[PDB]
């Protein structure tokens, strides 16, 4: 995994495009990947 650079990313099947940065927001223990009000992905947890 490479962050801070515009890369093609895919985690378990999300298969999106974007640059990944370390995020302040905290997930729930079970919740895997977040989303925004516009149904666009905004935060993902690395499975590893």
């Amino acid at each position: 995994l490479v962050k801070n650079k515009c890369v093609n990313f895919n985690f378990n099947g999300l298969t999106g495009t974007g640059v990944l940065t370390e995020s302040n927001k905290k997930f729930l223990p079970f919740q895997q990947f977040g989303r925004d009000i516009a149904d666009t992905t905004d935060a993902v947890r690395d499975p590893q």
Binding site: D36, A38, T40, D42
Partner: peptide, 22 residues
């Protein structure tokens, strides 16, 4: 008074400080 899928927003030519100055 109170992400990108191709669409974008452009900043106004007169920013809020310049509009306040006007």
């Amino acid at each position: 008074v109170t992400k990108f899928n191709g669409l974008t927003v452009l900043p106004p030519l007169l920013t809020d400080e310049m509009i306040a100055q006007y």
